[PDB]
Design an enzyme around this catalytic site. Sequence first.
Site, short mmCIF file in Angstrom:
data_model
loop_
_atom_site.label_atom_id
_atom_site.label_comp_id
_atom_site.label_asym_id
_atom_site.label_seq_id
_atom_site.Cartn_x
_atom_site.Cartn_y
_atom_site.Cartn_z
N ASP A 198 0.89 -1.14 0.00
CA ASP A 198 0.00 0.00 0.00
C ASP A 198 0.95 1.22 0.00
O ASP A 198 2.07 1.15 0.53
CB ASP A 198 -0.85 0.01 1.26
CG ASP A 198 -1.96 -1.01 1.23
OD1 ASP A 198 -2.12 -1.73 0.22
OD2 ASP A 198 -2.67 -1.08 2.23
N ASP B 285 0.76 3.83 1.64
CA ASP B 285 0.88 4.48 2.94
C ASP B 285 1.49 3.71 4.11
O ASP B 285 1.35 4.13 5.27
CB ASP B 285 -0.51 4.99 3.36
CG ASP B 285 -1.49 3.87 3.51
OD1 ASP B 285 -1.05 2.70 3.58
OD2 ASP B 285 -2.71 4.16 3.57
N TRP C 19 -13.39 -1.34 -1.77
CA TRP C 19 -12.65 -1.76 -0.59
C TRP C 19 -12.92 -3.15 0.01
O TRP C 19 -14.05 -3.65 -0.02
CB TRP C 19 -12.86 -0.71 0.49
CG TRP C 19 -12.00 -0.89 1.70
CD1 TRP C 19 -10.75 -0.36 1.93
CD2 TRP C 19 -12.35 -1.63 2.88
NE1 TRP C 19 -10.31 -0.72 3.19
CE2 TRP C 19 -11.27 -1.49 3.79
CE3 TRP C 19 -13.46 -2.39 3.26
CZ2 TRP C 19 -11.27 -2.09 5.06
CZ3 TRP C 19 -13.47 -2.99 4.52
CH2 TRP C 19 -12.38 -2.83 5.40
N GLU D 118 -10.02 -8.49 -1.02
CA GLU D 118 -9.05 -9.01 -1.97
C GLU D 118 -7.87 -9.68 -1.29
O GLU D 118 -7.35 -10.67 -1.80
CB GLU D 118 -8.59 -7.91 -2.93
CG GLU D 118 -7.40 -7.09 -2.47
CD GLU D 118 -7.70 -6.14 -1.31
OE1 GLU D 118 -6.72 -5.72 -0.66
OE2 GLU D 118 -8.87 -5.81 -1.05
N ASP D 119 -7.46 -9.17 -0.13
CA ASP D 119 -6.34 -9.76 0.59
C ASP D 119 -6.72 -11.14 1.15
O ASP D 119 -5.88 -12.02 1.21
CB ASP D 119 -5.82 -8.84 1.71
CG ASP D 119 -6.94 -8.28 2.60
OD1 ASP D 119 -8.07 -8.06 2.09
OD2 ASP D 119 -6.68 -8.03 3.80
N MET E 99 1.20 3.38 9.52
CA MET E 99 0.36 3.68 8.38
C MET E 99 -0.03 5.14 8.52
O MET E 99 -0.51 5.56 9.57
CB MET E 99 -0.93 2.85 8.36
CG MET E 99 -1.69 3.13 7.07
SD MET E 99 -3.39 2.63 6.97
CE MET E 99 -4.24 4.05 7.90
N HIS F 86 -5.52 8.44 7.55
CA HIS F 86 -6.29 8.98 6.43
C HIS F 86 -7.74 8.53 6.44
O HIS F 86 -8.07 7.51 7.06
CB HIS F 86 -5.65 8.54 5.11
CG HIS F 86 -5.72 7.07 4.87
ND1 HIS F 86 -6.87 6.43 4.46
CD2 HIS F 86 -4.79 6.09 5.04
CE1 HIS F 86 -6.65 5.13 4.38
NE2 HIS F 86 -5.40 4.90 4.73
N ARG G 84 -11.42 7.49 4.35
CA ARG G 84 -11.70 6.60 3.24
C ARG G 84 -11.86 7.40 1.95
O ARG G 84 -12.30 8.56 1.98
CB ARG G 84 -12.96 5.78 3.50
CG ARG G 84 -13.10 4.61 2.53
CD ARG G 84 -11.92 3.64 2.64
NE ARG G 84 -11.95 2.83 3.86
CZ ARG G 84 -12.87 1.90 4.12
NH1 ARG G 84 -13.84 1.67 3.26
NH2 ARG G 84 -12.81 1.19 5.24
C1 LIG Z 1 -2.51 -1.46 5.91
C2 LIG Z 1 -3.88 -1.98 5.62
O1 LIG Z 1 -4.78 -1.99 6.47
N1 LIG Z 1 -3.96 -2.39 4.35
C3 LIG Z 1 -5.19 -2.94 3.74
C4 LIG Z 1 -6.42 -2.03 4.04
O2 LIG Z 1 -6.11 -0.68 3.61
P1 LIG Z 1 -6.96 0.47 4.02
O3 LIG Z 1 -8.33 0.32 4.80
O4 LIG Z 1 -6.05 1.42 4.69
O5 LIG Z 1 -7.46 1.22 2.75
P2 LIG Z 1 -6.69 2.31 1.79
O6 LIG Z 1 -7.65 3.43 1.63
O7 LIG Z 1 -5.36 2.70 2.32
O8 LIG Z 1 -6.52 1.34 0.53
C5 LIG Z 1 -5.32 0.57 0.27
C6 LIG Z 1 -4.33 1.11 -0.72
O9 LIG Z 1 -4.93 1.41 -2.02
C7 LIG Z 1 -4.32 2.55 -2.60
N2 LIG Z 1 -5.46 3.51 -2.90
C8 LIG Z 1 -6.80 3.32 -2.45
C9 LIG Z 1 -7.78 4.18 -2.73
C10 LIG Z 1 -7.53 5.36 -3.52
O10 LIG Z 1 -8.35 6.19 -3.83
N3 LIG Z 1 -6.19 5.51 -3.94
C11 LIG Z 1 -5.13 4.64 -3.68
O11 LIG Z 1 -3.98 4.78 -4.05
C12 LIG Z 1 -3.25 2.96 -1.65
O12 LIG Z 1 -2.00 2.33 -1.97
C13 LIG Z 1 -3.84 2.50 -0.36
O13 LIG Z 1 -2.91 2.47 0.73
O14 LIG Z 1 -7.60 -2.63 3.42
C14 LIG Z 1 -7.48 -2.66 1.94
C15 LIG Z 1 -8.81 -3.30 1.72
O15 LIG Z 1 -9.23 -3.34 0.38
C16 LIG Z 1 -6.20 -3.46 1.52
O16 LIG Z 1 -6.37 -4.82 1.77
C17 LIG Z 1 -4.95 -2.89 2.22
O17 LIG Z 1 -3.83 -3.68 1.79
MN LIG Z 2 -4.36 2.85 4.23
#
Ligand SMILES: CC(=O)N[C@H]1[C@@H](OP(=O)(O)OP(=O)(O)OC[C@H]2O[C@@H](n3ccc(=O)[nH]c3=O)[C@H](O)[C@@H]2O)O[C@H](CO)[C@H](O)[C@@H]1O
Ligand SMILES: [Mn+2]
Lengths: 272, 123
Positions: free
Chosen positions: A122, A124, A184, A187-188, A214, A217, A219
């Site tokens: 990711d 971030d 969202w 997939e993992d 992390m 941020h 959604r």
């Molecule tokens: C550290 C963590 O908890 N990681 C998981 C979590 O991330 P998160 O809930 O943190 O969601 P997120 O918003 O960070 O999405 C994951 C990654 O997608 C990318 N992104 C997403 C949206 C956008 O508009 N632009 C963009 O670049 C970016 O690299 C981001 O870090 O859940 C996701 C669920 O689908 C993934 O499984 C992530 O691997």
């Molecule tokens: Mn994130």
Amino acid sequence: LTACPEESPLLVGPMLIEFNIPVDLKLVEQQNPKVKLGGRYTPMDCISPHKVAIIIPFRNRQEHLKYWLYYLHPILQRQQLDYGIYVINQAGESMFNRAKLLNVGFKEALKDYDYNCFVFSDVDLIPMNDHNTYRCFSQPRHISVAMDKFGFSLPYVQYFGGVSALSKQQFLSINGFPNNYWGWGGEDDDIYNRLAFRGMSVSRPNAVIGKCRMIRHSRDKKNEPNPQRFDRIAHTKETMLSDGLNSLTYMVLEVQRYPLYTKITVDIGTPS
Amino acid sequence: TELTKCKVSHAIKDIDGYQGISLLEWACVLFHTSGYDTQAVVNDNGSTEYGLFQISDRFWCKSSEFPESENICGISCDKLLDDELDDDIACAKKILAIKGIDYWKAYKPMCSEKLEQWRCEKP
Ligand SMILES: CC(=O)N[C@H]1[C@@H](OP(=O)(O)OP(=O)(O)OC[C@H]2O[C@@H](n3ccc(=O)[nH]c3=O)[C@H](O)[C@@H]2O)O[C@H](CO)[C@H](O)[C@@H]1O
Ligand SMILES: [Mn+2]
Ligand SMILES: [Ca+2]
């Protein structure tokens, strides 16, 4: 020159990770003269057996990227890896598709070099300890095990989100990642199910070595929780055979080589 | 508020064993359902799910976007967005008695095995 030691003599162990002071990529490039156009780095000191392509799903996360680049290039060079950075940018404003962008990264990285390892990260997540090596192991490797977001603890033993590393063979063996997960989540877990079906277990560093931060941020619109995620996760065994690298289709709209990284903008379709 | 596995496990004892669902199963279900966030709000498709249990305004709670809802639980959905879980639990019990655990889509795929990890040892 010879093979790099099994463990890098450059590691510093724990590190302070902060997202306060602003980043200047020009500053970053200046402090990383050895990184070549496109964000490529090959050790001069020895020969590394880890040819690693680092793939980042991306859309509108430029500020996050700066921090990512600011912290990872130093760490990765210390880890003595022959690596390349790839930001797979999703064109358009349809539902975000993380896993599909990761498959694209795999395909596209292979056009540049004979990579044998792929780290999917990711944009971030920053590792807090350079002993947590960004390379591949005998078994699929889960890197972001103790995230400050989950209170520095793996949320469940089957969790494979955040940062992971699969050798070329491990990735090939599961027909890559799913293309059908729009929006969202899930997939993992689908990827976790594929590794298991192919008889692999997940390798992880302990939770101290695996600490990561992390960037905080909200959604993203266009990446709202996928309502079909749980039903999809229940059928991985049958769908992985038909949804993966073998059914990946997309269009490249632009390839950008920056001194610190390669940004590939793609049109990956819409929820079918 | 984002709670911990143990905070949740301690608050939902009255649901333990109800309809055959244990605390470990609920700890597992709630993590995937809302990430233990008492304020989680997720839209589905013309409907909205609220709180720790993600109770929907389609049939269970009354929202302002859908006042005509059956509001089977007899409660404003906004009451499912706070840290007082007694009304969330009572509504969840009605869902369990009426529809069953299948209301929570994560149960089957995510909570059928490796249940021991969900145990809270904190007294
Ligand atoms: C550290 C963590 O908890 N990681 C998981 C979590 O991330 P998160 O809930 O943190 O969601 P997120 O918003 O960070 O999405 C994951 C990654 O997608 C990318 N992104 C997403 C949206 C956008 O508009 N632009 C963009 O670049 C970016 O690299 C981001 O870090 O859940 C996701 C669920 O689908 C993934 O499984 C992530 O691997
Ligand atoms: Mn994130
Ligand atoms: Ca309440």
